Every structure is written in C-alpha cells, then in structure tokens.
Design goal:
4 copies of one chain form a homotetramer.
Chain A: E1 3-9, E2 11-12, E3 16-17, H1 28-39, E4 43-49, H2 54-59, E5 65-66, E6 81-82, E7 90-96, E8 111-115, H3 120-126, E9 132-136, H4 139-147, E10 153-157, H5 158-165, H6 172-175, E11 179-187, E12 195-196, H7 201-216, H8 219-227
Parallel strand pairs in A: 1-4, 1-5, 8-9, 8-10
Antiparallel strand pairs in A: 2-3, 6-12, 7-10, 7-11
Chain lengths: ~230, ~230, ~230, ~230
C-alpha cells in the first residue's frame, strides 16, 4: 500500500545506466529517487525504457513517476506536471578530439546528433547556423554515429558530456582523450525534474516538500557533490 | 543596467526586521535576496512595507520583487507568480505560557490572532473549530493582543513562532515563560518564495537558476543552517 | 566515558547567561564547551557559580573544568593550567552615554567598577591613573553602579562591553541607547581559555586537539561568527 | 625595518618544497608564515635547511624562527619555545604497495625508516614492537631507502604520507599506487608549531595573537582548506 514504480532511461550516465533486469541500476537519478522514496515511506522499483518511450509509458500509467534528466519545458508541461527541479539543466556540444571543430563558431554548417525526445534538436536549429539534426533513439547510437563520423558533433546533457570525456578511454590521462567539449555549457529549460501525469499533484507536492527537506539537512548537497 | 528594488516586510524575525536604519534590514530573507542579487550581478535595494501593503505595492510596480516569508498558495497564484520555494512553509499555533490552552485539542471556540495578508485566516476557517479570526496588520500588535487576552492564541510562521519562543524580550524567566507552542507545526501552501507580477517570468526564471546553483555549491545550506 | 562537570559564571553575555534554572544556560562559552565535550565523547553537565567562586570551586575539585571568559595570565598560571586559547582577550572601558567622561584621557581620578576575580583590578592600577578600583561580585550590579552614583565607569571584557553598548532596548535608535564605550579595546592576558587544575594535563591536551580539529573543519569559525 | 629570517626544511610536501636557489619555496608552512609576517609588519625571508640542521641553526641564531611541520613535544620544549599550534600533529606508517605488511601487528620486528630530527624514532620505540630505527636526513632518501628495501616501512607526518599516495605516480589511472598506508593515523605531540629560542617570548606572544586573529577572520580556514 506504499510502493512506487519509477521509469528511467536505459543509458545516460551519470544519471542512470541499466545493466539488465536482474541487476540494480546506478547513477545520480537512481540514488536521488531512491532517497525520496524512503522519505515517502514507500519502497522503490525502477523500470528502464528507451528515453523516448518514457513519455507514453507515464501517460499509460505503466509507471507512477519518471526521472531521467528530464528538462522542464513549456512543451512538456502541456501533458505533464513536474516536481521542483533538483538540478540546473545545461546542454553541451561534444565531438571527437580528432575533429577540426574547436570553437562554438565552427559548428556552422555541421551535422549535429541529438537524443530523440529531448529539446536539443530545437535548441540546435534555433541557433540558425545552418545545421542539420540527426535524431538518435539511444545514446549509444549517437556516440557510435559520432565515432563513425556520421555526425560532426553531438549536443547532450552537460554532465553527460563531461562524463564521457573523462570516461572514454579509461586511462585518457596516459593514452589521451577521445572527446573534447566545444564552447561553454548552454542553459536550456528550467531544470531537471521528476515528471508525472497532471492528476498526480498530491504525490508531486509531497515530493517537493521532501526535496526541500533534503536541501535543508545536507542530504542533497552530499549526494550532488559525490557526482558533480 | 541591472538594478532591483525589493519589497520586504517591516517586522517578522527571523525573516526580516526593519529597526529603522541603525542597521537597516537584517534577517534570513535579507541575506538570501542579497546573495541572489550578487549572483544575478544586480544592485539590490530594499523597501520595507507593513506586510499588508506589499501586494498592492507589487501590483503597482512600486517594487520589482517581494520577499517576506511569502507562501505559495493557489489564491496568490491567481495574480502573482512565484520563484522556486527557498524553504518549506509551516504555520504554528502559539499562546501565552500561562494559558488555559494546553494542547492542540483545546483550540476550538477561541479567538485566533492572524497576520493580515497571509493565508492563516483561511487556514483557521478551513479547520472549522468554531474559532474567530482577529486580523492584525502588525506582528507586534498581534503579540501584544495575545498577551492582553484580546485573542486566545495566534497562528503564524513556524520559524517565527520558534523565535518568539526563545526570547521575549530577553530572559523571560521572571514568572512563567511568556509564550508556548501548541501542537506540531502545520504544512501550509507550497513553500516560502520570491513573488512577482505574472509578466516578470523572465526575471523569475533567472532567480530560479540562481537558487539551484546556490543549492548545488553549498551556499544555500550554509545560509539556511546559520538561521535554522 | 569521561563524564565532566563544567563550572561557568552566572551572568556575562555573550559568553554565558544563566537565565534562572529554566532553559539552562546559553552563550558562546556554553556552545563551545558543549561541542568540545561532544567531540570528546563525554557527557557535559554545567554548574553555575558567581564568577569569583569558580576559582575555589575548581581548586576544591567541585568541577572538572572552568569556562567563563577566563583570561590566561601569569598570575593564574601559578595555580591553574589552561587549554589553548579559544579567542584573543581584550578589556574595554565603558560608561553611560550621559557621562562626562568622553575620552580615554578623561579616565583619571575616577571610581572604576571591576568584576571581582578578573585581572582587571590589576590592569586599572597598573595604568597608574590615580583610579580607585571598586569590586563587584555580579556583572548586573556593576552595570547598575554606572547609574546609581557608585562608579564613573567600568573595565570589562571587550565583547561584553560591546554587547551592552549595542543592547537596550530592542532597537537602540528609535528610542536611543544608554551605554557608550570609552577608548579602544585593551589587550590583556594571552587569550580566553578553559581552565583546570595542574594535574589535569591529560584532559587539557585532549581538549586542545579537539579545538584544533574544530578550527580545521570550520566548526569554530561558524560558532565564533554566530556570536561575534 | 623589521626583518625576520625563517628556517624551513628543504623537502616535505605539502608543508614545504624548495625547488632550488633562484627557485621559489611553496607549501602550507610557507603560506602560513608569509601571512603571519605581513600581519607582524615584518619582511619574510626563508632559508631552507636539511630538517635536522634546523635545531642548531635556530640555536646559533642563524634564523629568527623555524616552521617545518615542527611538533611540540616535552623534549623540545625543554630547549625551545613554541607558538600556539596551527594544526594537529599525527604520524602515519607507510610501506610499498607490494609489501607483505598490512597491519600494525605485521610491523613487529621490522626496520622502520624515520626522518632524523623528528620525534618519530622515539615514537617507534615507545610502541614496543621490537623495531630497528633507521635514520634518514632527507625525506627523498628515506622513501628511496624504502623502495630499495633498506627499511620495511616508514613513519612520517600524516599529511605527507597522504600526499605521497595521491601523487605516486601521476600516471596511475590504473597503473596503481606505489605505496599503501599501514594502520590509522597516530596522535603524536601537541601539534605543529612555530619554534624559537626561549628568550624570544615577546615575538612568540605577538605571533600567538596573530594566529588567533587569523582563526577569527577566516584567513586560517581559507588557507587550511586549500591544502587539506
């Protein structure tokens, strides 16, 4: 009588990564949601979907809530409600180290990879720098496309971009990095938040109070600092 | 060009206190607003108002924003917009230490002092315990009335009630104890927040990112712990 | 499992105030000792004495330690040992605002109130200004003595004098003030410290390490800033 | 004008590191002494010495003061005086990562390397584990001796041991570390302090006031948190 089912994406470190249904997930979103549920006195069970499928999954009540670096945007608020944001949302351009692109200005006329379902395609085109957007359903496909030079660069979450540049290869310190960031991070949307259906305002309100109490007792800061 | 005129109340410790000009304004709301403006790279100038006068003042654009333990409520959302809450909002019943009222259960058929402009008169009525609401424009007048039995008890901000519980004026250890809390704190509204007119959504969105940034680097926790 | 009984004075804000046997005592000395015992993993029990009675109390082993704005002086080192100082020690001359004494230079041939037991009687005499020391067992009386024709001024702890000049009533500007400081603060002794009997060197060394740890992690600065 | 010559060691990161003659000196001790000298209104000139050479140097008045992770002990206090300690003193056993030693019990009957001049040889023998103490004049010679299996382990300052493993080497993403710590840190002495000849008590007392002042205004904490 107090168990929640949370939908999260399958792969977008450091927010969350799914390693099979018979193994626990890990990442910042996982740990945050986990903590919020214990404060709600409710057990927590996660359900991983491909990012873009999260929207219909929530609408069909397959899950009670969704947390997957979900950026609060006006377009999404037309069908869903959000909790207080738990983190500022910024995008970041990333490309391979062997790329001639080195400045935010060199992105002109380039093909940009984007994760299907995010507001990033819109961000790229709104810049009006003659760019073409390639939609990728999985982050793995997008990074593969980048490696295969199918796209010149990719616009993804800032913390996700930083993760990759410091994670691939393992010893980039000795062998050198595979990725490099282009330009500074870009403010987009109104923060990452927990999403729900409009009629779940009672649950969202309880989660907001919990988020405020976590920011007040240091729990939020401790977790946030461990990751970022 | 970035100068902000902020309206706050004249007396409601620990949120803000206007002693005239011997130190101007001091309190949690003051420090928080100043930090926010510092990060916005804007000059901050405060204008102190009797709580009640803050609403028409903002509606008349006499100030750009208002911060004064302002609770997000559906009623106020009808004519104003709010930034992300910076603290959980809770009300608290208080009375004279030597009052026949001993527990929360004794709060029926009584006169309750309330600060005019807050959602507390509505809170008292909603609890429907045949209590009469007496409106006080100033906190000091509500406290004086409580002592002189004009009212049987008062409903105010939790942190404010705690403040009066730890000083009145100095060492209230001369027969009695002055004030005493009745019942546990009560959840009301959706948190304390910075208020503005609906058409100031751009400025509210900047402040929201600042709050998230302050929460991420420890600045928020530091200030919060300093006071509560 | 140390279990300590700490002697402190009855009244000397902002160091300690024993507001009767109601809500115990509070102040910088109280908060400091509390935190030290917590880190020492030792239970902490306070026993309030008239300042001058602390010396014989400690010597007679009535208390284990003494914290009461106790200045490290060569005189006292003859019968007691001290922990590392937790703050610099300074004295300050004070009088009523309506006093004719305007400058430090006016303090000659006057009756100077001094808290019995402190090194201040010695300081007044050392300055060789033909002043007469008038002993006061209690601080309150010393303060009253500045208005009942008992003394022309008093020499007390800087922070204490500063406290009294900055207090009375609740907003000393809309109604006024009553006490004023004469001259700049005077360096005296080698700091305020926790005092013990000579054979308690083991306990004092444990305390010194805790003080260093508090200063290293920010705990000391936070407490110090909160009061001064 | 007022000129002070300060003796410090040649190499013991993070306390101090001397890169050469026309080379600058850096480290926590360096920064702390320079700040103290500014506050004393004294010029600050460092002279680097092999650690053990500092004692005769100070005694022969070659320098006015000595700052070099110098620990306050009963033995040294008999011939020198110390300022208030600026940090807690702790030692730490360290050995090669491949060493069979892994706990305190494993240290029984081993050769322990110690920096000549420190109280570490005395500490080793006081722990009675039947160890042979090998004296090293320089930290680099000691660590080399350890790597050359001339000693089975080494006892040194805690923060230095900590440094040797967060920097050995600098291309160890997975190459692993060259050392490992044996046991937890051990409390030794009464803290790191500035040393002087017994007749220099006036200067030491001025320094003590300056340390207290640095701790009160945040200067100390700022500098400390930068290294530790």
């Amino acid at each position: 009588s107090l168990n929640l089912t949370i939908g999260t994406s399958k792969f977008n470190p450091p927010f969350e990564v799914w390693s099979g249904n018979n193994s626990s997930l890990y990442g910042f979103d996982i740990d945050l949601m986990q903590e919020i549920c214990r404060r709600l006195h409710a057990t927590c069970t996660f359900e991983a979907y491909i990012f873009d499928d999260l929207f219909p999954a929530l609408k069909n009540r397959e899950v009670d809530l969704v947390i997957a670096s979900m950026i609060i945007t006006d377009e999404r608020k037309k069908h869903f409600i959000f909790s207080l944001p738990y983190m500022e949302s910024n995008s970041q351009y990333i490309t391979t180290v062997d790329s001639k692109i080195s400045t935010f200005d060199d992105l002109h006329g380039k093909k940009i990879g984007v994760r299907k379902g995010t507001p990033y395609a819109r961000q790229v085109l709104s810049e009006n720098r003659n760019n073409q957007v390639i939609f990728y359903e999985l982050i793995q496909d997008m990074l593969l496309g980048l490696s295969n030079n199918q796209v010149d660069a990719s616009l993804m979450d800032y913390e996700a971009a930083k993760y990759w540049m410091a994670s691939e290869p393992y010893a980039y310190k000795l062998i050198g990095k595979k990725y490099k960031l282009i330009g500074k991070k870009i403010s987009i949307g109104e923060g990452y938040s927990i999403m729900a259906n409009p009629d779940q305002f009672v649950l969202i309100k309880k989660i907001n109070k919990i988020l405020l109490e976590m920011e007040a007792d240091g729990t939020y800061l401790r977790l946030y600092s461990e990751y970022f």
